[PDB]
Amino acid sequence: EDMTKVEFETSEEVDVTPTFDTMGLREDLLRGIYAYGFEKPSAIQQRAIKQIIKGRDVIAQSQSGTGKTATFSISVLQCLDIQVRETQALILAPTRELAVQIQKGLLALGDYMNVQCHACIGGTNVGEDIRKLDYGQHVVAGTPGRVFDMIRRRSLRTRAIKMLVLDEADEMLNKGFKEQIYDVYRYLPPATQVVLISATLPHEILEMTNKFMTDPIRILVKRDELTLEGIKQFFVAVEREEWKFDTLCDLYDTLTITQAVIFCNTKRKVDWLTEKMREANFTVSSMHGDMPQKERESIMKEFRSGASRVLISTDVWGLDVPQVSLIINYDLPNNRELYIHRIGRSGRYGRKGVAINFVKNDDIRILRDIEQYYSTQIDEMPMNVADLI
């Protein structure tokens, strides 16, 4: 299935950390991370780790094998004060076997950190659990019931707890552990950070996040959906093709633009407009269908990096460009279905945006076609558009 292809979105804008060395991890942890075999962080990791370690409450959701276990294991270790011989993080899991598996993972990644971690066994080993907890373990993991018993017994001191991880939360709920989980949370310190990991988002989980969390970051599998909702769409009656470039230039003399994306219908127009803007001293990346997907992705990297402030493209892609201030449809697409793919919001958390359509009288009908087809509204651009960004 290649779980590396799984895409995520976040409920607010976040720093996307492409490498483990750009996450701001302590060095002895990084040593453990690389020593384990990690090279490149997964998509969930490039988003969730930074947010957890900086202290945010986090809900992370996706099917198995996207890197969720490493995500909370690494984050828990990062936040440990090894010099404090008291439990600082609690990890609840649906089974004892998974708790043990989690412990071993933590010990491996934390091997250069002198971390102490214990998975509560129970059974004929409850006495042994108690001994270890009394000694002091930085991290303790186990089922909600077992962990709750140790807290209630006072074997697991809670005063230094700063973190609570709910691993496979939906599964714990399915096993009937809801009460125990609320019971655990009720005995923890007021400012405790909570991280919830779950493949699914049923109501009990969302209510749980509402009760356990404060301004949580939601990091979820991206919804495969596009909409024009939230996109401010305008048109400018340019009347003639030959009037397009002057108008584009005037927009740049009147608007505040970080980066912009400009669509044209043809490779020919893209090549032409690129030459024209460059000659006008714009920094431009250009993209079209004649180039392999690898080139297009590399050029997108260059543009995202800020090497150019204008990206000019045919229909080859929605876009993900957080620094893009505006999308300009220099050409209106002959086909109506390409319109939303140019300017649409993808996912439930897709960025709001602004689109400016250049419309020739020649295109008067195609513009109207678009409006009808998506049942949307595209206003004539007002002079004070700069105020509306």
Partner: protein, 277 residues
């Protein structure tokens, strides 16, 4: 927003629009100047900064020094990703027109203070980032950085520490070079906050990050990116502007007004332009 007057109506493309006199000409030239500056500021990046400067210098940026200052300040606020480039641009202009760099700095300082006062984190983050890079470019004296960091760190809040740490990342390497004892005092202060204070996870993490950055010698935060160190050391003019001073932003310079000595003032500028080219 509810204060500023509302001017509606459809935008009209220039090609379409075109399809006493002293006042009329001054106003027209003023409007063209504002647009030209606005365009140049939108265009500027690392690979083209030299041409942008050359094109900017052709314009009367003395008459339009308020216009230029406003465009640069608004641009950096909306596009802090290009702060380093705006700093280099300011650095070049300041080397030729120190009074213009001084006007930008005065307003930027006031902008930071407004943000701090209003608890506007975003504006504190971007204005401080600009300050850091104007320091990196020797346009502003480092005393300003030190004073802002002290202010931010006196009664440390989550937000005040965030601003301070992001700020120190950007100007820290420069600070280390020109004022090692000053930056040492900042780090000691952070250390006291990290231990001699009751702080949350967010603050503790951002500080550990700052010490980590200092240890690697600011490897990811160089003073000036290759391609942006374009003013000769001895040609720069470093303004000593403290944080607290009662600066006049001179925003009135942004508003069109009839100039009686318009003729003289115009011919005066072209005499300057021919000088530095």
């Amino acid at each position: 927003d509810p204060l500023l007057t509302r001017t509606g109506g459809a935008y009209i493309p220039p090609a379409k629009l075109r399809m006493k006199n002293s006042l009329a000409y001054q106003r027209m030239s003023w409007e063209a100047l504002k647009k030209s500056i606005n365009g140049l500021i939108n265009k500027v990046n690392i690979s083209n900064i030299s041409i942008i400067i050359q094109e900017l210098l052709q314009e009367n940026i003395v008459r339009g020094r308020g216009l230029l200052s406003r465009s640069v300040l608004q641009a950096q606020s909306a596009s802090p990703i290009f702060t380093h480039v705006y700093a280099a641009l300011v650095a070049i202009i300041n080397s030729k027109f120190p009074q213009i760099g001084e006007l930008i700095l005065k307003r930027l300082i006031l902008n930071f203070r407004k943000g701090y006062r209003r608890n506007d984190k975003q504006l504190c983050l971007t204005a401080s980032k600009f300050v850091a890079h104007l320091i990196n470019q020797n346009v502003a004296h480092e005393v300003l950085c030190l004073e802002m960091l002290t202010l931010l760190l006196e009664r440390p809040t989550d937000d005040s520490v965030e601003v301070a740490i992001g700020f120190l990342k950007e100007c820290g390497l420069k600070l280390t070079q020109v004022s090692p004892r000053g930056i040492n005092a900042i780090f000691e202060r952070l250390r006291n906050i990290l231990h001699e204070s009751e702080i949350d996870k967010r603050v503790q993490y951002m500080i550990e990050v700052m010490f980590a950055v200092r240890k690697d010698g600011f490897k990811d935060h160089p003073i000036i990116l290759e391609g942006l160190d374009l003013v000769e050391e001895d040609d720069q003019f470093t303004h000593m502007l403290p944080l607290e001073d009662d600066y006049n932003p001179e925003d009135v310079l942004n508003v069109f007004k009839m100039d009686p000595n318009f003729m003289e003032n115009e011919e005066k500028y072209k005499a300057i332009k021919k000088e530095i080219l």
